[PDB]
Amino acid sequence: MKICLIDETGTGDGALSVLAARWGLEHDEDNLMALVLTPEHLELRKRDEPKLGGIFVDFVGGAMAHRRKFGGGRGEAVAKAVGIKGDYLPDVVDATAGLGRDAFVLASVGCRVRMLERNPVVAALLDDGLARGYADAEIGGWLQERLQLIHASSLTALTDITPRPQVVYLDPMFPHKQLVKKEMRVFQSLVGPDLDADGLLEPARLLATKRVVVKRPDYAPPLANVATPNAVVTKGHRFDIYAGTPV
Template identity: 50%
Template sequence: MNETSPGRVAVHWLNPDLESAARLLAARLNLPPYAEGDAADLLLQLGDDGLSLLATAEDAPGAVRVDFVEGALAHRRQYGGGAGQMVARAVGIRGSIRPRVLDATAGLGRDAFVLAALGCEVTLIERQPVIAALLADGLQRAREAGGEVAEIAGRMQLLEGDAIELMAAWSGAVPEVIHLDPMFPHRQKSALVKKEMRLFRPLAGDDLDAPQLLAAALALASHRVAVKRPRKAPIIEGPRPSAELTGQSSRYDIYGKRRLEAD
């Protein structure tokens, strides 16, 4: 698990009509509701447009929310390069092959959404409850949006819990490919360029159990495990990958078990 203190997180509502729903959410997440003047490092905010996470420090970045309907993900869905994207190649999408994927470190669900948009059935696991709540909210709004986005979200199933434990006790259809993107221990502030990282690191910390995560994935996946890493980061402790895909800022270490074939 991680070594980072999660800080003080409170649930805030941006509309008086949402107070009841926000208090229910706070109780489910075992977090305090926010009152003016309370000390909180992070606010999980419920507004008319769903959930968002906001840091309260003066130099903090803006709020983060999961939005599969508009913005960057909508643009990526339409113009992101399709099956030529690195994540698609890493999980083995080619021709008519659309593997059944488990994204065991879901985060904001961006990679999972890309894979689902390309036709894969994707199960997502997120162990940090606040991040899981943001992701569940984004998936619900996508399903309610109708059209293509709802169809894509229909291929995504979210599980909340520890991925190592869930994979060890797996009872459903065995994932052909497992996608991992463990939080890498950054030592320099200059590395924290994305506002999501600045917000989520106090919550999720670094995935110091990445070797155990990889071992559990290798034991479960039927065909391959694809591990996303910073481009210059060392491989995760354990077996060496059988292949590598390298991009400008990141790479994928591929651990092959069997060749993916079209149905």
């Protein structure tokens, strides 16, 4: 995958070169987007719009820490969709991690989560945030065990995953046009619709032993057109619930 790789560390240790090779990233000097390695973290920027700033994955502060403390935890719409209740904290596989926002909530509530991200540039951002998150004196401990990243095809590896997770969560990039903030304008400018999203449902329902949860924006059709009477509705979107495959 092509993108403008920029080093703002000054160390000269070759860290960016290693990270690029690890995720199969190719430097593209005149690419519209740029992946920058700062002393603080790895961020994505929209070169033609400096005023927008850069976006990065941070489990320690910012929006993720705010949502952790104020979002409600087990009371979140996504927490209820996966079936979280009482002492029930299922193992989850998030086949469309993206920025890891939902995945972080689930891990924060007490779920053992395994994230998968096929997009190399997004995966690079997650890995960097995971590195920083693991190094946190407060959450670094449980984070390292409840939130881990895996690089593989969510269509082929979604079957070889072991041990089988009780729940599989899906939230593929839906073909949108409707963002309002910078954290999305920059990102959306990079990541486009997941053309094979519909193909995720089947392998997901096979992997999960209890439930498959699909986040869907309002009015969006169910994934793969497979209807379901079970769903948790929220503001601006819903979570379609499907039965998994008992062991």
